[PDB]
Amino acid sequence: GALTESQAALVKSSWEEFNANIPKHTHRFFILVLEIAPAAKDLFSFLKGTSEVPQNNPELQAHAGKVFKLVYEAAIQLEVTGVVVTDATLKNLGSVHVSKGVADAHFPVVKEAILKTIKEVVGAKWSEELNSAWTIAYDELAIVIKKEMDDAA
Numbered sequence: 001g002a003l004t005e006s007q008a009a010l011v012k013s014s015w016e017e018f019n020a021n022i023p024k025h026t027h028r029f030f031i032l033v034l035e036i037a038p039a040a041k042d043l044f045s046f047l048k049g050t051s052e053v054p055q056n057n058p059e060l061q062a063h064a065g066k067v068f069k070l071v072y073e074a075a076i077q078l079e080v081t082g083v084v085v086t087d088a089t090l091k092n093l094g095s096v097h098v099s100k101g102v103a104d105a106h107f108p109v110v111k112e113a114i115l116k117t118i119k120e121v122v123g124a125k126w127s128e129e130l131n132s133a134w135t136i137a138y139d140e141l142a143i144v145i146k147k148e149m150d151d152a153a
């Protein structure tokens, strides 16, 4: 697809939409995750010992926010510059994933959880051109973190 001026414009627009409702979109995101894979629950400190996904847990919200921000920033960087840049942050990310017992096969779990979360976020404005644009941006960012985990192990 690339990332035409027209596609980037489409990701920015859709992320602004996500940020607009953190406690919802983040609890939704954790449920889509536990739907695709239930065992994932024991991983998260704030999910252990609980029976359901907490809805107002600051720890959980802050956590999931950070996750989507990172995928958006990735799309813009692709349109302007043509790439996704690896920094300190992406590297520390790779460490903590490993401490917590996270693997590569976990990634399509979280991707489908994010496309489905954004399809849910933009509703009728959804286009092939937009799906194509977030897909390209996740794929490109996952490529980068998986790369850093393997390096933290």
Ligand code: HEM
Pocket: 040, 043, 044, 045, 046, 062, 063, 066, 067, 068, 070, 071, 093, 096, 097, 100, 102, 103, 106, 107, 108, 110, 138, 141, 142, 145
């Ligand atoms: C491009 C995709 C991804 C991004 C951008 C991302 C980002 C992050 C960030 C920023 C943190 C730390 C947040 C904090 O300090 O508050 C974190 C923690 C964590 N992540 Fe991810 N992540 C991704 C994929 C995954 C996958 C596929 C899994 C596996 C299910 C996972 C499992 C975890 C766990 C268990 C923690 C520790 C939470 C704790 O017990 O408090 N992440 N992630």
